Amino acid sequence: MKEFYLTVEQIGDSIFERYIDSNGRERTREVEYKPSLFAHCPESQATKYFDIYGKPCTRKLFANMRDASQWIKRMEDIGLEALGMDDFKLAYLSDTYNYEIKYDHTKIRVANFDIEVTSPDGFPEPSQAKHPIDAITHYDSIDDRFYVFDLLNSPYGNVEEWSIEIAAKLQEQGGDEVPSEIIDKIIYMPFDNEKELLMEYLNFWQQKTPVILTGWNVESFAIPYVYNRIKNIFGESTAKRLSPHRKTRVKVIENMYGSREIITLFGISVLDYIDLYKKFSFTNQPSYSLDYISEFELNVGKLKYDGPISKLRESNHQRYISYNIIAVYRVLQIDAKRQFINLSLDMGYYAKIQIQSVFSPIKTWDAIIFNSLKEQNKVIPQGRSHPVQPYPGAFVKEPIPNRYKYVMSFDLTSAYPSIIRQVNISPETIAGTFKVAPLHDYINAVAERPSDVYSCSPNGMMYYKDRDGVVPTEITKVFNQRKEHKGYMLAAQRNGEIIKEALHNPNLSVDEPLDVDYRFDFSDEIKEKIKKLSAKSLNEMLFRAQRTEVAGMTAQINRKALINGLAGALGNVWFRYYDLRNATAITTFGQMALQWIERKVNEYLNEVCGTEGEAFVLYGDTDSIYVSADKIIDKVGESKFRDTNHWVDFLDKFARERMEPAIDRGFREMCEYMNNKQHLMFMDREAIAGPPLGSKGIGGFWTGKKRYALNVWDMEGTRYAEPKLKIMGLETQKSSTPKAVQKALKECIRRMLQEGEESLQEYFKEFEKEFRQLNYISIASVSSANNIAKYDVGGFPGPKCPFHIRGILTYNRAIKGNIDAPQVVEGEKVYVLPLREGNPFGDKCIAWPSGTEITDLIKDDVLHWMDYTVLLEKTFIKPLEGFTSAAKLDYEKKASLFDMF
DNA sequence: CGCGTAAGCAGTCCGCG
DNA sequence: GCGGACTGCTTAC
Numbered sequence A: 001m002k003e004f005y006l007t008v009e010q011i012g013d014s015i016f017e018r019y020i021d022s023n024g025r026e027r028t029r030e031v032e033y034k035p036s037l038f039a040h041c042p043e044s045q046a047t048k049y050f051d052i053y054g055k056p057c058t059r060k061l062f063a064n065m066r067d068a069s070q071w072i073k074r075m076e077d078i079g080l081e082a083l084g085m086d087d088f089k090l091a092y093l094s095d096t097y098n099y100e101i102k103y104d105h106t107k108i109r110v111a112n113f114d115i116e117v118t119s120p121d122g123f124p125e126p127s128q129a130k131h132p133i134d135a136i137t138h139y140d141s142i143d144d145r146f147y148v149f150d151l152l153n154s155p156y157g158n159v160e161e162w163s164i165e166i167a168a169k170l171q172e173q174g175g176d177e178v179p180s181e182i183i184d185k186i187i188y189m190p191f192d193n194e195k196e197l198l199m200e201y202l203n204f205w206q207q208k209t210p211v212i213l214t215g216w217n218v219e220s221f222a223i224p225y226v227y228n229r230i231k232n233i234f235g236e237s238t239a240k241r242l243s244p245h246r247k248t249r250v251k252v253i254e255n256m257y258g259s260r261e262i263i264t265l266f267g268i269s270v271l272d273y274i275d276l277y278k279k280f281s282f283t284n285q286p287s288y289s290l291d292y293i294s295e296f297e298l299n300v301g302k303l304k305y306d307g308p309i310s311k312l313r314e315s316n317h318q319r320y321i322s323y324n325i326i327a328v329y330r331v332l333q334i335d336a337k338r339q340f341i342n343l344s345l346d347m348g349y350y351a352k353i354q355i356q357s358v359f360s361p362i363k364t365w366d367a368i369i370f371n372s373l374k375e376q377n378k379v380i381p382q383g384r385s386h387p388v389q390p391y392p393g394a395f396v397k398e399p400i401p402n403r404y405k406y407v408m409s410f411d412l413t414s415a416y417p418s419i420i421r422q423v424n425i426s427p428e429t430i431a432g433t434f435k436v437a438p439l440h441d442y443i444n445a446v447a448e449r450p451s452d453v454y455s456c457s458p459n460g461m462m463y464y465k466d467r468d469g470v471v472p473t474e475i476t477k478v479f480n481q482r483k484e485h486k487g488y489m490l491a492a493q494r495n496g497e498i499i500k501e502a503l504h505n506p507n508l509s510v511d512e513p514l515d516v517d518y519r520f521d522f523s524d525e526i527k528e529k530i531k532k533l534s535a536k537s538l539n540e541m542l543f544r545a546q547r548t549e550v551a552g553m554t555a556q557i558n559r560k561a562l563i564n565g566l567a568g569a570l571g572n573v574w575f576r577y578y579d580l581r582n583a584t585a586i587t588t589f590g591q592m593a594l595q596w597i598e599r600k601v602n603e604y605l606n607e608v609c610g611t612e613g614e615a616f617v618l619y620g621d622t623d624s625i626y627v628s629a630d631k632i633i634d635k636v637g638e639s640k641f642r643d644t645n646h647w648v649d650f651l652d653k654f655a656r657e658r659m660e661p662a663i664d665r666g667f668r669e670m671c672e673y674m675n676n677k678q679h680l681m682f683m684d685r686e687a688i689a690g691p692p693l694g695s696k697g698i699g700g701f702w703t704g705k706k707r708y709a710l711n712v713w714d715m716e717g718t719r720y721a722e723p724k725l726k727i728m729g730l731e732t733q734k735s736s737t738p739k740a741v742q743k744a745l746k747e748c749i750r751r752m753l754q755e756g757e758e759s760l761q762e763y764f765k766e767f768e769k770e771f772r773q774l775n776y777i778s779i780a781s782v783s784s785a786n787n788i789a790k791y792d793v794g795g796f797p798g799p800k801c802p803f804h805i806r807g808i809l810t811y812n813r814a815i816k817g818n819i820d821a822p823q824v825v826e827g828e829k830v831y832v833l834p835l836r837e838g839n840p841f842g843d844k845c846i847a848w849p850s851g852t853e854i855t856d857l858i859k860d861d862v863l864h865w866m867d868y869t870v871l872l873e874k875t876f877i878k879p880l881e882g883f884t885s886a887a888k889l890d891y892e893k894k895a896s897l898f899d900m901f
Numbered sequence B: 001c002g003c004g005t006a007a008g009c010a011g012t013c014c015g016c017g
Numbered sequence C: 001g002c003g004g005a006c007t008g009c010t011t012a013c
């Protein structure tokens, strides 16, 4: 097999590399790598090295890496560009792995761990590490084993050994219900003292050194806690044994308000799963506790116990340990679903970077672009300093707030990356400028043609047409991977709908789910067998189909995120190829494209309908259009349709056969107007929306920009067994809206769009009457809490104090003088409830850490003083009033002359 | 900590005769 | 009350 790196580090004048050798064995080496950098040279000087603009360069080979770094600094002192990859480990990987890397994940040691620390005096600060580590569970991917290190004797209690037999029993047998599928994979190690536990942990760590190190909050808590605890007990050199090169660094993580400390372990790639989830899941969660995220992702019940965690070990060590093991398994379960580890390895090896660098789109693109250019003996420019400057982005159309009955939507495939490829936007393809006319003049095709030579953007930029730039070339490669995975995702989604259909008529039989590849549309034979299956088998297939779809979604959406990130990187001052001319070339072309195609679709439909000046495009945002299809439907007349699916086919057919060719012609003209290199504006049909045939449903509504709802029957070729709501921006979609309020508002919208005004009025009356019985957590608002200190004036609200911050200060006063009972963490999320006039808390709201029950000290007082009236007006009635006025409906029945009999 | 901009709504402070 | 100036937060793309 071809070799591949696991980790790489620069330590002084040495490169330290852990790798898999040609025999699939893990090895480590230290290599005194001599880097090269570059300077411009005269043309009379013969070379094979050229900068990206075609100017000749001489290669400078250094005795060592520090020499190279010193040269860079001197070049700055002289005032001359020092060209080349200045991140030497990236150059080392490029020289050592000069081919497309094939990696074998089964050879990569992936460690998932969690620690427990009993603390009576509040949260155990990792930088202090003053309390004993009393449990460690460490899963090894190569062994497939959970290693449990259990402290029996502590200053906070001496306990009995954990029992695997009790751990396996049902909660209803007094057990811990540790999943039977991991019972035989647990390797249990009790210890009489903490010193021997840690000493044994480090020895195990040497034998089985993690390559990829993950778990939940391991980077901010577990890793620094273990390092600092070992440091405090044994000294620094022993703590540095967590790094296979015995090198570590305290890294200061700064943000807008304050900073925090992490421990960089050289030769380890830390991928904290919380950070993988936030980056790759495309959710925004009210809480990031592992129990909350596990509930969300896996529908597993919260890990339940009596008393605080600080008393759990001494009161129920059996459960304490089982829940530590379960915590580790839960992260593994989430990853089997979301596959964020697999994703990170794919992208990291593709770019030829340190795996943990997948967190940085700038670092990822820098390496992809460097490896690409290096292949043609081209030489990358020096990174430079730039002041942060604002620049313009997308166009969004102001919609007329209304109901809209029948709607069809269209948007560009991979908009910004497609703009890059079409126009040929790249640092090295800039050809010059042309004199710009107002954007309006290009939209309406009255402005002079920009160039008869070069490919243009309405921002004034011109680009070469003889050859692809490196940005277009490389963005195309990831785009293509993206397309493949999106293909698998959509097929699994369509397959899911077939299974849902079949479930209306399940057979009374005993059988198995079919062995199938859900990434590919079901053949007729499979469809035939499916209609003969039991409910049990069908459901399992549905679960498997939806897992495949999730796998497809992870692979495609994060590849889209990377290529969209290159467009954004052009407007980030730290990017090597930062250029506001290119960043604005993309966004400004996007503005034209949308408004151009809006004009064209309007013109085409006015012609089709024999009218003039009517707006068929009601809305659009960035790269998308929403077309009113009332007139298309009315031209055949609703009476002609058999059922809803009939008009859906008709609109589907109209979009494919009439709209899209019209749209394509409009864009091909635009491409020639701009003299672009290649036509790549592909605006495919997204949604087909309307009320159920025969109903009083309103179909859809818009309240303003980025705020709308549609009753969708077909989405990108997926025909749903049941209509699905596409809701954007409205309160049902915000993590700040109470859980139960999101649900009630969604149902109000369902009824508006599918059933009509009277159905909505019936539901509202019921919700208003019953909502006071909702559990307080379900009706609490949610907000991030930044700058709690800035607004704290002797424990009271200072000027301009945010409402959610006021709640926190109220909480702080009410718990003051409690070393136990949870503190609100700066920068994390809180639940917020209003309080009625004249409460014991002395203020109008209270906030507490999100994902948690409010501490029992004040819970009963909070519940008694919760302002249900304010809560209902603010989170439910006010948004609903917004929805219904836009849609020209009333959520309460008005008086009529019929009320007279 | 980690690519970009546009733009919505909650809330505070305060004007508005 | 409601809106504009402003801060804070969150979402659409």
Ligand SMILES: Nc1ncnc2c1ncn2[C@H]1C[C@H](O)[C@@H](COP(=O)(O)OP(=O)(O)OP(=O)(O)O)O1
Binding pocket: A411, A412, A413, A414, A415, A416, A417, A560, A561, A564, A565, A568, A622, A623, B004, C013
């Ligand atoms: N998260 C983001 N980061 C940066 N730019 C974005 C992001 N989301 C959207 N954009 C910009 C770039 C996109 O190409 C453009 C259109 O957005 P959108 O339609 O959501 O994605 P897309 O057109 O790239 O892919 P798709 O083919 O799935 O429509 O808006």
Ligand SMILES: [Ca+2]
Binding pocket: A115, A116, A324, A327
């Ligand atoms: Ca724990």
Ligand SMILES: [Ca+2]
Binding pocket: A411, A412, A413, A414, A415, A623
């Ligand atoms: Ca798009």
Ligand SMILES: [Ca+2]
Binding pocket: A502, A505, A506, A507, A530, A531, A532, A533
């Ligand atoms: Ca059947």
Ligand SMILES: [Ca+2]
Binding pocket: A411, A412, A621, A622, A623, A624
């Ligand atoms: Ca879009």
Ligand SMILES: [Ca+2]
Binding pocket: A411, A412, A413, A684, A685, A686, A716
């Ligand atoms: Ca599409």
